[PDB]
Enzyme design. Structure first.
Site, PDB file in Angstrom:
ATOM      1  N   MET A  25       0.748  -1.235   0.000  1.00  0.00           N
ATOM      2  CA  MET A  25       0.000   0.000   0.000  1.00  0.00           C
ATOM      3  C   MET A  25       0.786   1.298   0.000  1.00  0.00           C
ATOM      4  SD  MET A  25      -3.302  -1.035   2.176  1.00  0.00           S
ATOM      5  CE  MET A  25      -4.105   0.323   1.378  1.00  0.00           C
ATOM      6  N   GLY A  26       1.973   1.303   0.574  1.00  0.00           N
ATOM      7  CA  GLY A  26       2.787   2.504   0.651  1.00  0.00           C
ATOM      8  C   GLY A  26       4.245   2.196   0.932  1.00  0.00           C
ATOM      9  N   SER A  27       5.101   3.194   0.838  1.00  0.00           N
ATOM     10  CA  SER A  27       6.538   3.013   1.046  1.00  0.00           C
ATOM     11  C   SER A  27       7.040   3.077   2.491  1.00  0.00           C
ATOM     12  CB  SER A  27       7.299   4.032   0.198  1.00  0.00           C
ATOM     13  OG  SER A  27       8.605   4.211   0.695  1.00  0.00           O
ATOM     14  N   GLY A  28       6.160   3.349   3.439  1.00  0.00           N
ATOM     15  CA  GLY A  28       6.580   3.419   4.823  1.00  0.00           C
ATOM     16  C   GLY A  28       5.693   4.351   5.613  1.00  0.00           C
ATOM     17  N   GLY A  29       8.129  -0.346   7.181  1.00  0.00           N
ATOM     18  CA  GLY A  29       7.435  -1.616   7.309  1.00  0.00           C
ATOM     19  C   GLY A  29       6.757  -2.044   6.020  1.00  0.00           C
ATOM     20  N   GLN A  30       5.843  -3.015   6.120  1.00  0.00           N
ATOM     21  CA  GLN A  30       5.131  -3.565   4.964  1.00  0.00           C
ATOM     22  C   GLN A  30       3.664  -3.760   5.329  1.00  0.00           C
ATOM     23  OE1 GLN A  30       6.745  -7.230   3.379  1.00  0.00           O
ATOM     24  NE2 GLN A  30       7.452  -6.266   1.459  1.00  0.00           N
ATOM     25  N   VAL A  31       2.778  -2.962   4.708  1.00  0.00           N
ATOM     26  CA  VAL A  31       1.324  -3.128   4.803  1.00  0.00           C
ATOM     27  C   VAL A  31       0.765  -3.477   3.422  1.00  0.00           C
ATOM     28  CG1 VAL A  31      -0.871  -2.126   5.426  1.00  0.00           C
ATOM     29  CG2 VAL A  31       1.166  -1.505   6.723  1.00  0.00           C
ATOM     30  N   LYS A  46      -0.658  -5.985   7.971  1.00  0.00           N
ATOM     31  CA  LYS A  46       0.734  -5.721   8.326  1.00  0.00           C
ATOM     32  C   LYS A  46       1.482  -7.037   8.530  1.00  0.00           C
ATOM     33  CE  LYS A  46       3.556  -2.740  11.372  1.00  0.00           C
ATOM     34  NZ  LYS A  46       4.691  -2.975  10.444  1.00  0.00           N
ATOM     35  N   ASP A 140       2.692  12.445  18.399  1.00  0.00           N
ATOM     36  CA  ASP A 140       2.951  12.878  17.023  1.00  0.00           C
ATOM     37  C   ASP A 140       1.783  12.469  16.114  1.00  0.00           C
ATOM     38  OD1 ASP A 140       3.530  10.145  16.875  1.00  0.00           O
ATOM     39  OD2 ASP A 140       5.099  10.455  15.352  1.00  0.00           O
TER      40      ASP A 140
HETATM   41  C1  LIG Z   1      -0.512   8.634   4.146  1.00  0.00           C
HETATM   42  C2  LIG Z   1      -1.032   7.222   3.910  1.00  0.00           C
HETATM   43  C3  LIG Z   1       0.145   6.273   3.665  1.00  0.00           C
HETATM   44  O1  LIG Z   1       0.995   6.581   2.892  1.00  0.00           O
HETATM   45  N1  LIG Z   1       0.257   5.006   4.376  1.00  0.00           N
HETATM   46  C4  LIG Z   1       1.378   4.032   4.154  1.00  0.00           C
HETATM   47  C5  LIG Z   1       0.804   2.770   3.501  1.00  0.00           C
HETATM   48  C6  LIG Z   1      -0.249   2.180   4.362  1.00  0.00           C
HETATM   49  C7  LIG Z   1      -1.299   3.167   4.714  1.00  0.00           C
HETATM   50  N2  LIG Z   1      -2.194   2.471   5.664  1.00  0.00           N
HETATM   51  N3  LIG Z   1      -1.805   2.059   6.878  1.00  0.00           N
HETATM   52  C8  LIG Z   1      -2.825   1.465   7.460  1.00  0.00           C
HETATM   53  C9  LIG Z   1      -2.766   0.872   8.856  1.00  0.00           C
HETATM   54  C10 LIG Z   1      -1.643   0.810   9.703  1.00  0.00           C
HETATM   55  N4  LIG Z   1      -2.048   0.221  10.812  1.00  0.00           N
HETATM   56  C11 LIG Z   1      -1.237  -0.073  11.984  1.00  0.00           C
HETATM   57  C12 LIG Z   1      -0.834  -1.547  11.899  1.00  0.00           C
HETATM   58  C13 LIG Z   1      -0.216  -2.047  13.204  1.00  0.00           C
HETATM   59  C14 LIG Z   1       1.037  -1.577  13.572  1.00  0.00           C
HETATM   60  C15 LIG Z   1       1.609  -2.036  14.748  1.00  0.00           C
HETATM   61  C16 LIG Z   1       0.924  -2.943  15.549  1.00  0.00           C
HETATM   62  C17 LIG Z   1      -0.334  -3.396  15.184  1.00  0.00           C
HETATM   63  C18 LIG Z   1      -0.917  -2.946  14.003  1.00  0.00           C
HETATM   64  N5  LIG Z   1      -3.359  -0.098  10.712  1.00  0.00           N
HETATM   65  N6  LIG Z   1      -3.800   0.320   9.487  1.00  0.00           N
HETATM   66  C19 LIG Z   1      -3.955   1.499   6.552  1.00  0.00           C
HETATM   67  C20 LIG Z   1      -5.303   1.057   6.537  1.00  0.00           C
HETATM   68  N7  LIG Z   1      -5.885   0.369   7.676  1.00  0.00           N
HETATM   69  N8  LIG Z   1      -6.046   1.267   5.452  1.00  0.00           N
HETATM   70  C21 LIG Z   1      -5.562   1.923   4.375  1.00  0.00           C
HETATM   71  N9  LIG Z   1      -4.310   2.358   4.359  1.00  0.00           N
HETATM   72  C22 LIG Z   1      -3.480   2.150   5.422  1.00  0.00           C
HETATM   73  C23 LIG Z   1      -0.722   4.434   5.350  1.00  0.00           C
END
Ligand SMILES: *CCC(=O)N1CCC[C@@H](n2nc(-c3cn(CCc4ccccc4)nn3)c3c(N)ncnc32)C1
Length: 262
Positions: A25-28, A29-31, A46, A140
């Site tokens: 989904m994005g450049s920043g 970990g790996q989602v 994640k 933050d």
């Molecule tokens: C500005 C938006 C952007 O560039 N990004 C990066 C790519 C992923 C985008 N995104 N992140 C989540 C997300 C993240 N988390 C936290 C996961 C976690 C971390 C540590 C411990 C437990 C869980 N949850 N969701 C997105 C979601 N849910 N949907 C769409 N895009 C998401 C953000």
């Protein structure tokens, strides 16, 4: 627990193979964006590799602990389940649309006060929840941490490992003006110096902002942390009270912005 996806109150026994990888989904970990093949639902996942940095994996797991305990907060991105394999942990999250930083980029200008009003209510209530219920102090909040979807929901993510209220102030100014207040700084230390040496960056007075919005930002941007107010006081601010009850169609605004080109 683990090995189950709960989506909409329906609990589904599941394993990692039941998920189709639709891309990063994005450049920043790996989602990853993934599709649950059994239903067609699409989720954010994640991935934490066993081979990753040992100390950094402990930090992800401590955040996950908070996320898992945050099911009763409507303003925090929800976890649908986890998968543990021999080499990985996969954390399934509800799929949101995008973050405020990207909405700002696609808008190419100021985000309207009515949208920022609903956003402020969501974020403040998320922060207070994390403090009051878990002793978590996130400091933050930034536009990349604030997620929205086409159903008009606004939720916080990535909040793990008072001071919080300053970053909300700065995010609001950035989103309301379209301009990051510290854009011209070339180092992080330079930003720190500016924060300490200059007056707070308040909202401009020639953009139609309500007195309530200006007052709220001025309150968030109090330099002396002893004069920064409590959460139960911030939650009584006229800006919050207005947007707790005012009907704002965030969903349609979101769809309109996302349909713009770049
Ligand atoms: C500005 C938006 C952007 O560039 N990004 C990066 C790519 C992923 C985008 N995104 N992140 C989540 C997300 C993240 N988390 C936290 C996961 C976690 C971390 C540590 C411990 C437990 C869980 N949850 N969701 C997105 C979601 N849910 N949907 C769409 N895009 C998401 C953000």
């Amino acid at each position: 627990q683990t090995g189950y996806l709960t989506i909409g109150g329906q609990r589904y026994q599941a394993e990692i193979n039941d998920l189709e990888n639709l891309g990063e989904m994005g450049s920043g970990g790996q989602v990853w964006k993934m599709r649950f093949r059994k239903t067609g639902h699409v989720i954010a996942v994640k991935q934490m590799r066993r081979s990753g940095n040992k100390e950094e994996n402990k930090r992800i797991l401590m955040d996950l602990d908070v996320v898992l305990k945050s099911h009763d907060c409507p303003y925090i991105v929800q976890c649908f389940g986890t998968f543990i394999t021999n080499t990985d942990v996969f954390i399934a999250m509800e799929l949101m649309g995008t973050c405020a930083e990207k909405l700002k980029k696609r808008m190419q200008g100021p985000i309207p006060e009515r949208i920022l009003g609903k956003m402020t209510v969501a974020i403040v209530k998320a922060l207070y929840y994390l403090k009051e219920k878990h002793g978590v102090i996130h400091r933050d909040v930034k536009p990349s941490n604030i997620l929205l979807d086409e159903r008009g929901q606004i939720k916080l993510c990535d909040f793990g490992i008072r001071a919080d209220v300053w970053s909300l102030g700065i995010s609001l100014v950035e989103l309301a003006t379209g301009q990051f207040p510290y854009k011209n700084c070339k180092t992080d230390f330079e930003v720190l110096t500016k924060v300490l040496q200059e007056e707070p960056p308040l909202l401009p007075g020639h953009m139609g902002f309500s007195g309530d919005f200006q007052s709220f930002v001025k309150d968030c941007l109090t330099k002396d942390h002893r004069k920064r107010p409590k959460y139960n006081k911030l939650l009584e601010h006229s800006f919050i009270k207005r947007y707790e009850t005012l009907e704002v169609d965030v969903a349609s605004w979101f769809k309109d912005v996302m349909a713009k080109t770049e």
